[PDB]
Amino acid sequence: MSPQELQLHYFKMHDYDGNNLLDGLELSTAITHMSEDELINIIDGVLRDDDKNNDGYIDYAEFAKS
Amino acid sequence: PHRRFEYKYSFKGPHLVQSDGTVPFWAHAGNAIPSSDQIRVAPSLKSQRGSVWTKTKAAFENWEVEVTFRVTGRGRIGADGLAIWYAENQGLEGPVFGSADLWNGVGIFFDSFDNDGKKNNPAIVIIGNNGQIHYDHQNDGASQALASCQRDFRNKPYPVRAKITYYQNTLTVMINNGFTPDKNDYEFCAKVENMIIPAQGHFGISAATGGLADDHDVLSFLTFQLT
Ligand SMILES: [Ca+2]
Ligand SMILES: [Ca+2]
Ligand SMILES: [Ca+2]
Ligand SMILES: [Ca+2]
Ligand SMILES: [Cl-]
């Protein structure tokens, strides 16, 4: 069971609606396993750095890239 | 048009409430009960009112909301209904489907019950307002409606979904009537052309009951920004 297989299993563990993408709300549940302003910074942060096409989602490719 | 999902103006399961009983980014009030797979905005008890509004205003020229919900009761007739809002101020409490009156923006009202006795309910009714109109509870918004359709959103096998789009000054409501599990099976309900609403506003959802009462459950409110 490789590192990447675990990145992937992790990714789809948080894809609760099964659309193969991670939206801000999905990420927020990972980021809390704190104030809302702390939470917003982190998420906004992730999306700025990692969401290339700027659609509010990060796909497995974009996820891995981090 | 390119759509961006806006988490900060959105909520959904399966981890909807956090442990202090709050919905991230949204304020709830009245009788609303947030569980984790949904918010029961108004449960099937007499004379309930509850609501859920975004904490901050959204400043999107064009947008879409995908709201998924159930309205459920023991009878073939229920009350009062459920409202989806975009409005200049939060309307946490009041007599209009549980939210405030004389609002400035638009409310999309899912009106379960036929107060005007025209046998034309349940119905979906678009109502604009400039901060000076009282919603006419007793006429089901009839003379104030910009547009409307009849659609029985109650007691359906699968959740109902409203897609509400404001693009290029026209407001379209599409409804998936919940007869099937296909979540993209939308049908046209209503449209208002050349409609002008505030450039910034809160998104909201509210519901209420009277002497009759359904549970009004909202599973998710997903907000998208358009271009
Ligand atoms: Ca997802
Ligand atoms: Ca993306
Ligand atoms: Ca009514
Ligand atoms: Ca009516
Ligand atoms: Cl969630």
DSSP A35-64: -HHHHHHHHHHHHHHH-TT-SSEEEHHHHH
Domain covering B1-227 assigned CATH 1.10.1740.10 in the classification:
no
Closest CA to B213 of B53, B92, B42, B35: B42
Q: How far is B85 from B94, CA to CA, in rounded Å?
A: 13
> Cβ separation of A23 and B13 shorter than 8 Å?
no
For residue B39, the Cα-to-chain-centroid distance in whole angstroms is 12
Domain locations along chain B: 1-227
Report CA Rg, chain B. Answer: 16
Domain covering A1-66 assigned CATH 3.20.20.70 in the classification:
no
- Token couple for A13: 């563990």
Is B103 near chain A, with CB under 8 Å?
A: no
Between the CA of B184 and the centroid of ligand 2 the distance, in Å, is 21
Domain locations along chain A: 1-66
Query: Distance of CA B180 to CAs A40, B36, B188, Å?
Result: 36, 24, 16
- Count other Cβ atoms within 10 Å, centred on residue B32: 26
Mapping DSSP to helix (H, G, I), strand (E, B) and coil, where does residue A29 land?
Answer: helix
* HSE-up of residue A36 (Cα within 13 Å, Cβ side): 14
Resolution expressed in Å: 3.0
Q: How far is B112 from B121, CA to CA, in rounded Å?
A: 6
- Residues with Cβ within 8 Å of B143's Cβ and at least 6 positions away in sequence, in order, are B136
Tell me if B23 sits within 8 A of B52, measured CB to CB. Answer: yes
Distance from the A54 Cα atom to the nearest Cα atom in chain B, whole angstroms? 7
Partners of B153 in beta bridges: none
> Cβ separation of A43 and B2 shorter than 8 Å?
no
- Residues with Cβ within 8 Å of B24's Cβ and at least 6 positions away in sequence, in order, are A25, A28, A36, A39, B11, B18
Give the residue ranges of DSSP H helices in chain B: none
Q: How far is A4 from A61, CA to CA, in rounded Å?
A: 11
Between the CA of A60 and the centroid of ligand 2 the distance, in Å, is 9
Is B14 near chain A, with CB under 8 Å?
A: yes
Closest CA to B100 of B72, B128, B131: B131
Name every chain B residue with its beta carbon within 8 A of the beta carbon of A25.
7, 10-12, 24
E strand residue ranges, B25-133 = 26-30, 33-34, 39-42, 49-54, 63-72, 81-87, 104-111, 123-130
Tell me if B8 sits within 8 A of A24, measured CB to CB. Answer: yes
Name every chain A residue with its beta carbon within 8 A of the beta carbon of B6.
24, 56
Tell me if B69 sits within 8 A of B214, measured CB to CB. Answer: no
Tell me if B5 sits within 8 A of A55, measured CB to CB. Answer: yes
- Main-chain phi, psi angles of B38, to 5 degrees: -170, 175
Q: How far is B184 from B194, CA to CA, in rounded Å?
A: 27
Between the CA of B138 and the centroid of ligand 4 the distance, in Å, is 9
Method: X-ray
